[PDB]
Design a protein around this nucleic acid. Structure first.
Ligand SMILES: [Zn+2]
Lengths: 126, 54, 204, 369, 121, 286, 240
RNA sequence: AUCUGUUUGGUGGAACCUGAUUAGAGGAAACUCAAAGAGUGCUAUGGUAUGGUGACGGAGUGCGCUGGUCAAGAGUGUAAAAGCUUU
RNA sequence: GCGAUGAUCACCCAUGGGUGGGUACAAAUGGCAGUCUGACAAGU
RNA sequence: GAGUCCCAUAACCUUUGUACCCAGUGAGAAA
């Protein structure tokens, strides 16, 4: 189960990768993608330029969590809920969030690179 | 009172310096100053199982 | 024991009352606890053993108080001046501590003061500490009347007069079993206790 | 509209009248969620109109079971028929707020003009009156509500589990733990009786060594006598009258006192063996298989040292302390006795037949050797 | 509800008895009632099988209370004779226990039977 | 709880209208204490009527969706249900009247051959309909005479109507020049108010159930609340996340305002922003 | 076995540590003179003469709550005057320790559904009067809503997959606002197809969906493999 | 032992260095006087305040209202029905 | 004419004794084990 | 002047009399 954020969705649509099919042929496993309410709040706050990205995040195949905090800082929410539990893949393309996630141990990181998704800290990919 | 602390004042030193009683025991590093309220008590092993902790 | 012999059961308590036991203010508490309770309901075949145990310990206390009557009688017929001074069971465990009445009579009054507190005494002598001041004589009624450091003081004067009366009782031959020497010694101790409870360390 | 409220509680039933509705749409908000914690604002919502108390713990347990399994009892019918207005059954029913969605159908089966609500609004109204409790009732109930709660919880649980006080092994625990105490009490008290009568003649404790028999015969002999006919309960009685003729030891008040002491010893001696008969009977009704196998007093001490019939049952068979061939009959009797105690504990009203079969098995095993 | 309540039907009974036979070959089965209660109070047990037709029934009904205390699955097979035959010994057994082991070659089978009897229970 | 009882893939196109009913069938009896009923028209030429399992009373203990399917030959654009007598009306290529028993329109009540974009029934005097046609027209219909009644042509297109629930002949129109018009049914020659403060086309209007103020959401991504006697906005609600508020209702509490935007979200607002919804002691109420 | 220890109060109120050469988690004994499940006891003579009061050793391999205490929990809500609703009082093993931590002035409602554990619960609640045994299913709190009112902490040692619904129902009925919610989650008994961190994350998400704010979780690993205690408080308004 | 000189424990606290604080650092008393903080308790209850300024009250009548029952109407259904619905 | 409802597992002599180590109970005018100080104080 | 109410009403040791010994395991046993 993979936590998505907003620039990962934007780079997915910019590189024409499907979310669940890109995840499946990246990991060769069955993926459950998760949009937290703060990532969804960030996509809605991005305005009416990003309508395509918002209604591709509105997808019944993409399940969605319910964050319980004030504010819509998705990087704080993703970092907290991943270092609490260590049962999550983080799909992101922010340089700062990528550095945070790859500094906390045991957390695999997925990112749009080239024309498909790549995964780094998951040691069983083939 | 100090009258009873002057009777249990030696085994409180033994519990403070636990770490050098057996050369194989190796406790976790606490300090353990003497607590303000304590009580000295004796273990009742019951009359159910014999010969093991007896 | 007397109350479970009286009522037995909780509904039986709801229909009965009692005043010769449990005086006048625990009745509403036992009735409220009889009305609401986390207790089960017993049968007759074990209520019978409950009742047998209750009458057993009632008769036990009857035997206790009549043995105390026997002790008071033998004590005021054997060493009556000690009974008039320090009391029946206190003088009784003095005599029973030291063995014989003559063996208690030939001991000094300081020994009769500290007579019960031997382990405190001898640890406070074998290291150089302060000795006790009460011993077995602490439970006399006069030392009960005293308060402060003067219960040590009248433990001392009570042991002195008790040595006087005790060796009179053990060593007299024309003794009359009437409490005369013990009674005049008790009057001496009582007015001494009066004159050192009249003083006060405050300044008026 | 949530017009009335029904709160069930161990002291009785309460019907409240809802004064002000709480918010429906803003029901998850912070101020609406903590107005039921503040009492000064909860009393703006709820007013007590009726409280029918119970007739006692019997009707309390009846209504606790009826409320538990979702039925309208007769006291419920009485208080609802007193308090709720005769509304229509086809147009604008009166609205009662309950906390039990399967008690609702039983309320509409009896009063068709009552629609019942237990959703989150009725739930937090109900937990508001649960949170405040004794303050809403304005002083009108007998009995503290938590004390009635303790009584009703214990009664409900023992009813639901069918707790019988006949098959209650704590009786036989306390019976044998008291019987050992009075064994040593009759022993030391009759030892002092023999000591105090030892200087009246020191041969009665030589001829008659049993404590009760010595004490009962010295309760009536206090002298010489001759007339040795009712002292046989007669070779020992004849020897005793011969020793009274050849008296060879030394009052009145002291002798009256040791008569009272021997009467005490006799009273202890026949309260014992009343207790022993009681615990053999209680052991036959509580553990018949154990008492068939190894006897009533032995089974009593076995479940006492185990702590309970349940602890002796759930103990392993190789860890039972019962009291070569002589070494392994103990192990055979141990695992058969553990088997018998399991039968006896977990059967609900036990028979004796499996204790009989295990007794037959262990006698066959000992007769084989 | 009888005393020997969570009885298994025939398919679950044969699944249970097959994994009992394999654990008995792999030395992971402690068989008999007091060995079962020994390994139960020691905590090395994954599920206990009681047979619901021995000559008393409380003789092994002492074990559901122990399993409930320590949260261990327990299941009632309706044949002590078939249970002993699956255990691989020449006598009927009335209770058996699958001890825990992680160097065990049948751990997936034991876990599947545990899940089946726990959804039963 | 802010959570859906049920969802329904109702149609294939846009669901262009939906309302709610208490369907007066004369063979069955409506169970309104456990079922709710909503019906809904779309541009795939269908009106569908659905039932919903509702947990509001605990009287009972069930075949929820799509109890019937009305069918038209052209598309539909609006729908509103009569507040009695099993009747509703659907606007579209032409405005038809329907009842929930018959599977076909009872009557076609169209002024001319110009289509109808919106519809509202009256709330008291329940037999007076009003509709907005794309020829910038507002038409009143009466259901005693089973006929249209009077129409007016305005400058731009009326997006919505709502009737005053407390005055029974007044309604408010919400139209494409950026303001709302408060009209009297007995004299449509003049508006009796104009509510002016919007800056793009007004998409939807609604009345408070107290009849004293209106809410008004528009194509500039903001909603506005107006006192009925003034004619300028008492309040504006906006959000960076809210885009193009297309639907606004005023909840029956008269205290909350439901807005449906076009990013997907339906949002609750307070009608009075500074007003909290706890119950109040008399000192704070005073 | 006959040795001497020193009793010392823990950080948590109502529980103690007996220091020797191995130190023991220890509680005061509400029913002095007998052991409940065969634990060992400590008898101090505290100073009419001094009275022999005694203490019971809390075994972390037979108690999830003691495993949590001596793994280190920042806040238990079981406290010496409180009311605890124990769910899944599977015998009197941990309920006795919770009972005498809570003390004579506080109440433990021990809810259990099976009947032979209920019989042992009632015979234990005789000698511990501050235990109200409730033999009922916790999945239907209305069946015993009449016997319990306004608890301060719920403890949940149920081992069922509908755990979070049971905890939520009992909390919404009987827990007060900002009261304690202590959960012992067993991963394998919830579900074994996913890993332990997935099921703990899902259970914590279920708790905050039923508005119980989690403060703290602890894996309690040397005593139980793939267990957890989640300590939360019943926020009821504003987890934010 | 006019042997020994290490360890443990108490007393003592130079020089350097580090940290904190500074109208030097405290201490004792209380049915003392003030300044503030936190928690708890208490029906803490007018959602628009008594049944009534002879302008009023009470009694009775008439209208109004509530419930069930029966009858009639109407719809729907049907060979006829029955049933069901009915602001 | 078996069994998991459990098989199995200190010194001296040509079943019986001799010699003692631990267990509990009770006793002891057995032991530890030795019964404080000694002339001022209170008041006016 | 002065440490008992905190088991000298006691604790431990020694000797003397009375009753015993010197649990786990887990598939074998018999011929
Ligand atoms: Zn978030």
């Amino acid at each position: 189960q993979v936590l998505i954020d907003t620039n990962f969705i934007n780079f997915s649509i910019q590189k024409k990768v499907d979310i669940v099919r890109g995840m499946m042929d990246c990991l060769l496993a069955k993926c459950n993608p998760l949009i937290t309410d703060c990532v969804m709040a960030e996509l809605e706050k991005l305005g009416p330029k990003y309508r395509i990205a918002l209604k591709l995040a509105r997808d019944p195949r993409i399940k969605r969590l319910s964050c319980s905090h004030k504010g819509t800082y998705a990087d704080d929410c993703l970092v907290h809920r991943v270092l609490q539990h260590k049962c999550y893949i983080v799909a992101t393309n922010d340089a700062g969030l990528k550095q945070r996630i790859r500094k906390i141990p045991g957390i695999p990181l997925m990112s749009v690179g080239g024309h498909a998704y790549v995964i780094e800290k998951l040691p069983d990919v083939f | 009172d100090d009258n009873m602390r002057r009777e249990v004042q030696r085994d409180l030193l033994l519990i403070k310096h636990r770490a050098a009683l057996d050369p194989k025991r190796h406790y976790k590093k606490q300090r353990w100053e003497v607590p303000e309220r304590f009580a000295i008590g004796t273990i009742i092993e019951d009359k159910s199982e014999f010969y093991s902790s007896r | 024991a007397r109350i479970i012999l009286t009522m037995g059961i909780r509904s039986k308590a709801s229909e009965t009352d009692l005043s010769e036991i449990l005086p006048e203010e625990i009745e509403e508490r036992v009735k409220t606890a009889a009305e609401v309770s986390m207790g089960t309901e017993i049968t007759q075949t074990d209520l019978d053993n409950i009742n047998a145990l209750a009458e057993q310990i009632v008769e036990f206390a009857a035997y206790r108080e009549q043995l105390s009557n026997y002790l008071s009688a033998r004590m005021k017929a054997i060493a009556p001046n000690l009974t008039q001074l320090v009391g029946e069971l206190v003088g009784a465990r003095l005599i029973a501590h030291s063995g014989s009445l003559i063996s208690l009579a030939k001991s000094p009054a300081s020994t009769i003061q500290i007579l019960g507190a031997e382990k405190a005494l001898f640890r406070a002598l074998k290291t150089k500490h302060d000795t006790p001041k009460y011993g077995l004589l602490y439970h006399a009624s006069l030392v009960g009347q005293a308060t402060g450091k003067n219960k040590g003081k009248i433990a001392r004067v009570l042991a002195a007069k008790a040595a006087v009366s005790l060796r009179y009782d053990a060593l007299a031959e024309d003794r009359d079993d009437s409490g005369d020497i013990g009674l005049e010694s008790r009057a001496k101790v009582e007015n001494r206790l009066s004159q050192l409870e009249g003083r006060d360390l405050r300044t008026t | 509209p949530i017009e009335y409220l029904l709160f069930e509680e161990p002291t009785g039933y309460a019907v409240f009248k809802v004064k002000l509705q709480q918010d429906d749409i803003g029901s998850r908000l912070k101020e609406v969620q903590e107005q039921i914690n503040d009492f000064g604002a909860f009393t703006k919502l709820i007013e007590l109109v009726s409280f029918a108390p119970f007739k006692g713990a019997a009707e309390a347990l009846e209504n606790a079971n009826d409320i538990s399994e979702g039925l309208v009892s007769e006291s419920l019918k009485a208080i609802l028929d007193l308090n709720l207005p005769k509304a229509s059954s086809k147009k604008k029913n009166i609205t009662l707020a309950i906390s039990d969605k399967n008690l609702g159908p039983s309320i509409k089966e009896e009063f068709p003009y009552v629609d019942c609500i237990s959703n989150e609004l009725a739930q937090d109204l109900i937990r508001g009156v649960r949170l405040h409790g004794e303050k809403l009732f304005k002083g009108l109930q007998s009995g503290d509500l938590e004390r009635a709660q303790l009584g009703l919880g214990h009664a409900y649980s023992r009813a639901k589990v069918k707790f019988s006080v006949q098959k209650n092994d704590n009786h036989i625990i306390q019976a044998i733990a008291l019987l050992d105490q009075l064994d040593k009490d009759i022993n030391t008290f009759a030892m002092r009786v023999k000591e105090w009568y030892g200087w009246h003649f020191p041969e009665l404790a030589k001829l008659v060594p049993d404590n009760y028999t010595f004490a009962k015969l010295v309760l009536f002999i206090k002298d010489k006598a001759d007339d040795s006919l009712h002292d046989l309960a007669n070779e020992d009685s004849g020897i005793a009258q011969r020793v009274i003729d050849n008296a060879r030891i030394s009052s009145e008040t002291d002798m009256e006192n040791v008569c009272v002491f021997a009467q005490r010893v006799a009273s202890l001696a026949d309260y014992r063996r009343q207790l022993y008969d009681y615990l053999c009977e209680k052991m036959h009704t509580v553990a018949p298989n154990l008492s068939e196998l190894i006897g009533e007093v032995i089974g009593a001490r076995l479940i006492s040292h185990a702590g309970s019939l349940t602890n002796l049952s759930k103990q392993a068979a190789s860890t039972v302390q019962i009291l070569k061939n002589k070494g392994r009959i103990s192990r055979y009797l141990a695992n058969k006795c553990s088997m018998a105690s399991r039968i006896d504990n977990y059967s609900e009203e036990p028979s004796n037949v499996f204790g009989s079969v295990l007794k037959k098995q262990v006698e066959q095993r000992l007769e084989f050797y | 509800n009888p005393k020997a309540f969570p009885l298994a039907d025939a398919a679950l009974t044969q699944q249970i008895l097959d994994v009992v036979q394999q654990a008995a070959n792999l030395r992971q089965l402690k068989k008999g009632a007091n060995e079962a209660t020994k390994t139960l109070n020691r905590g090395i047990s994954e599920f206990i099988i009681m047979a619901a037709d021995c000559e008393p029934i409380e003789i092994l009904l002492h074990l559901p209370l122990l399993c409930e205390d320590k949260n261990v699955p327990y299941v009632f097979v309706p044949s002590r004779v078939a249970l002993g035959r699956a255990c691989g010994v020449s006598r009927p057994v009335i209770a058996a226990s699958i001890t825990t082991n992680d160097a065990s070659a049948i751990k997936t089978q034991i876990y599947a039977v545990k899940d089946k009897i726990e959804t039963l229970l | 709880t802010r959570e859906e009882f049920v969802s329904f893939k109702a149609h294939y196109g846009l669901v262009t209208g939906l309302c709610v009913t208490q369907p007066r069938f004369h063979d069955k009896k409506p169970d309104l204490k456990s079922q709710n009923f909503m019906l809904s028209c779309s541009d795939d030429k269908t009106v569908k009527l659905w039932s919903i399992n509702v947990d509001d009373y605990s009287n009972k203990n069930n075949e929820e969706g799509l109890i019937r399917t009305f069918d038209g030959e052209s598309a539909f654009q609006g729908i509103d249900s009569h507040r009695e007598n099993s009747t509703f009306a659907t606007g579209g290529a032409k405005i038809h009247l329907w009842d929930v028993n018959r599977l076909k329109p009872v009557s076609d009540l169209s002024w001319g051959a110009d289509n109808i974009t919106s519809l509202k029934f009256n709330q008291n005097e329940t037999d007076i309909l009003a509709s907005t046609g794309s020829d910038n027209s507002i038409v009143l219909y009466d259901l005693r005479t089973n006929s249209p009644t009077q129409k007016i042509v305005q400058t731009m297109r009326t997006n919505a109507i709502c009737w005053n629930p407390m005055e029974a002949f007044n309604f408010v129109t919400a139209n494409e020049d950026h303001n709302a018009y408060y009209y009297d049914m007995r004299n449509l020659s003049r508006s009796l108010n104009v509510f002016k403060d919007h800056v793009s086309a007004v998409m939807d209007v609604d009345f408070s159930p107290t009849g004293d103020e209106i809410v008004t959401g528009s194509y500039d991504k903001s909603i506005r609340i107006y006192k009925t006697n003034h004619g300028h906005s008492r309040e504006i609600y906006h959000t960076k996340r809210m885009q193009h508020v297309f639907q606004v209702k005023y909840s029956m509490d008269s205290k909350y305002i439901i807005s449906g935007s076009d990013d997907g979200n339906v949002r609750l607002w307070r009608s009075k922003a500074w007003e909290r919804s706890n119950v109040k002691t008399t000192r704070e109420k005073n | 076995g006959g040795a001497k220890v020193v009793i010392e109060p823990h950080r948590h109120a109502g529980v103690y540590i007996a220091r020797g050469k191995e130190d023991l988690l220890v509680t005061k004994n509400m029913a002095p003179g007998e052991s409940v499940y065969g634990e060992k006891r400590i008898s101090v003579e505290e100073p009419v003469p001094p009275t022999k009061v005694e203490y019971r050793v809390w075994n972390p391999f037979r108690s999830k709550l003691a495993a949590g205490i001596m793994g280190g929990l920042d806040e238990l809500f079981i406290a010496p005057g409180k009311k605890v609703l124990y769910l899944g009082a599977a015998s009197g093993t941990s309920v006795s320790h919770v009972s005498d931590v809570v003390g004579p002035e506080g109440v433990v409602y021990a809810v259990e559904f099976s009947h032979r554990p209920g019989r042992e619960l009632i015979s234990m609640a005789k000698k511990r009067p501050n235990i109200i045994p409730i033999i009922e299913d916790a999945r239907h709190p209305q069946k015993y809503r009449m016997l319990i009112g306004m608890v301060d902490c719920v403890f949940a040692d149920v081992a069922q997959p509908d755990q979070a619904r049971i905890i939520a129902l009992n909390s919404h009925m009987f827990l007060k606002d900002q009261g304690g919610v202590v959960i012992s989650i067993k991963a394998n008994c919830i579900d074994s197809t996913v890993d332990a961190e997935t099921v703990f994350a899902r259970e914590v998400q279920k708790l905050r969906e039923e508005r119980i704010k989690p403060l703290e979780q602890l894996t309690l690993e040397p005593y139980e493999r793939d267990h957890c205690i989640v300590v939360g408080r019943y926020m009821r308004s504003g987890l934010k």
